[PDB]
Amino acid sequence: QVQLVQSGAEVKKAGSSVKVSCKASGGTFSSHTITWVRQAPGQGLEWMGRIIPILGIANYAQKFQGRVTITADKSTSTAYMELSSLRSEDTAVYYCASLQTVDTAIEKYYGMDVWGQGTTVTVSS
Amino acid sequence: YELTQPPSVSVSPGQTASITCSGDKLGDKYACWYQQKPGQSPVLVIYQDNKRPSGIPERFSGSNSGNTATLTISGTQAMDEADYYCQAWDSSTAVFGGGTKLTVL
Amino acid sequence: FELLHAPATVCGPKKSTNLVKNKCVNFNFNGLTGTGVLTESNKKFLPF
Amino acid sequence: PLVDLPIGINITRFQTLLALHRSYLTPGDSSSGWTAGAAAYYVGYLQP
Numbered sequence: 384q385v386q387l388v389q390s391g392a393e394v395k396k397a398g399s400s401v402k403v404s405c406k407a408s409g410g411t412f413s414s415h416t417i418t419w420v421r422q423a424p425g426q427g428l429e430w431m432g433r434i435i436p437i438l439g440i441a442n443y444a445q446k447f448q449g450r451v452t453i454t455a456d457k458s459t460s461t462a463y464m465e466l467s468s469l470r471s472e473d474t475a476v477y478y479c480a481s482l483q484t485v486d487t488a489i490e491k492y493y494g495m496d497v498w499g500q501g502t503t504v505t506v507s508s
Numbered sequence: 509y510e511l512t513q514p515p516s517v518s519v520s521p522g523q524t525a526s527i528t529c530s531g532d533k534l535g536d537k538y539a540c541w542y543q544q545k546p547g548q549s550p551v552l553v554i555y556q557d558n559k560r561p562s563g564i565p566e567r568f569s570g571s572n573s574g575n576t577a578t579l580t581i582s583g584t585q586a587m588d589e590a591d592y593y594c595q596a597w598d599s600s601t602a603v604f605g606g607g608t609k610l611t612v613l
Numbered sequence: 614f615e616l617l618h619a620p621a622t623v624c625g626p627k628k629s630t631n632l633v634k635n636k637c638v639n640f641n642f643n644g645l646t647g648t649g650v651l652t653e654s655n656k657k658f659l660p661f
Numbered sequence: 662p663l664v665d666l667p668i669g670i671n672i673t674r675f676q677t678l679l680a681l682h683r684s685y686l687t688p689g690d691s692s693s694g695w696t697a698g699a700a701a702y703y704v705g706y707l708q709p
Contacts, residue, residue, distance in 0.1 A: 427593065427605060427607050621667055
C-alpha cells in the first residue's frame with residue numbers, strides 16, 4: 384500500500400525555479416516506478432516522464448525536452464525534480480503516480496495504479 | 509500515435525454508452541482508459557486490454573478492434589459523471605487525448 | 614593487509630606447450646602427471 | 662553434469678522460483694492471482 388502524499392499549493396513569482404516532490408510514507412520507495420502527469424483545465428492530460436528509483440533511468444517527453452531535471456535517491460526515499468523557464472500558459476496541476484514495476488519493457492503490462500491529490504501551482508506576475 | 513476523439517457525449521441514464529477512441533494504429537498496443545471525477549483524483553479502470561481490475565464494479569467493458577478501441581458502459585448511474593482519457597504506451601512514451609465528458613439527463 | 618580470507622583463489626594461469634604423439638613422453642594434463650605413449654584413438658565419449 | 666560453482670557457503674534451506682502470468686489485476690494492488698499452470702514439480706533428498 385502507498386499514499387504518495389505531497390505538499391500543498393505554493394505561491395511564487397514568475398520565472399523562478401519550481402521544485403515539487405511526492406513522498407510515499409507507505410510502501411517501499413523502490414520497486415515502484417514513479418511517473419508525473421500534468422492536469423490542466425480544458426486541456427487534457429500532459430505526460431512529463433518517469434523515473435525508476437532502483438534502476439535510476441529517467442525517460443523524457445517530447446515537449447519537456449531539456450526543461451526538466453528529474454532525480455531520485457533511495458537513501459532519502461523521496462523523488463524530486465527541478466523546473467525552469469515556466470510561463471503562465473504552462474501553469475497547471477501536477478500529479479504523481481506509481482506503475483508497480485521497475486522494468487522498462489513491462490510498463491505496458493500495467494497502469495497508473497495510484498494517483499496523488501494534485502498540487503496546484505500559481506504564478507504571480 | 510495521435511489521438512482525436514469527440515469533445516463530449518450525452519446519454520440517458522441506465523442506457524448502454526459506447527465511446528470510440530480513434531487514432532493511428534492503436535490496435536494491438538495495450539491501450540488504457542482512465543476515469544477522473546470532479547473533485548476526485550483519476551483512478552484506474554482499464555488495463556492492457558479493456559480489462560476491468562477486480563474491486564471496481566463490473567459496469568465498464570470494451571474490446572480492441574483492428575484500428576479502434578471501444579468502451580461499453582452497463583448500468584449507468586448518476587455518480588458516473590467523470591471524464592475518460594484513453595492512452596497507450598507507444599514508443600516508450602505515453603500520449604493523453606483530449607478526453608470525453610459524460611452527460612446524464 | 615594479510616591474505617587467505619576465502620577459499621576462492623585469484624592468481625596467474627598455467628602455461629601450455631605443443632603436443633607430441635607416438636613416443637614415450639612425460640605429460641601434465643590439468644595437473645595429471647604421468648608417462649606414456651600419447652596416440653589418437655577411434656573411441657569417443659561424452660564431451661564433459 | 663552441467664556446471665560447478667565455488668560458492669563456498671553453507672546452505673540449509675532452498676525455495677523454488679516459478680514464473681507466473683498476470684491473469685488479472687486489481688487497483689491498490691492486493692496481490693492479485695496469476696496463472697502458470699499446474700506447477701507440478703518434485704523434490705527429493707540425497708543420502709550417502
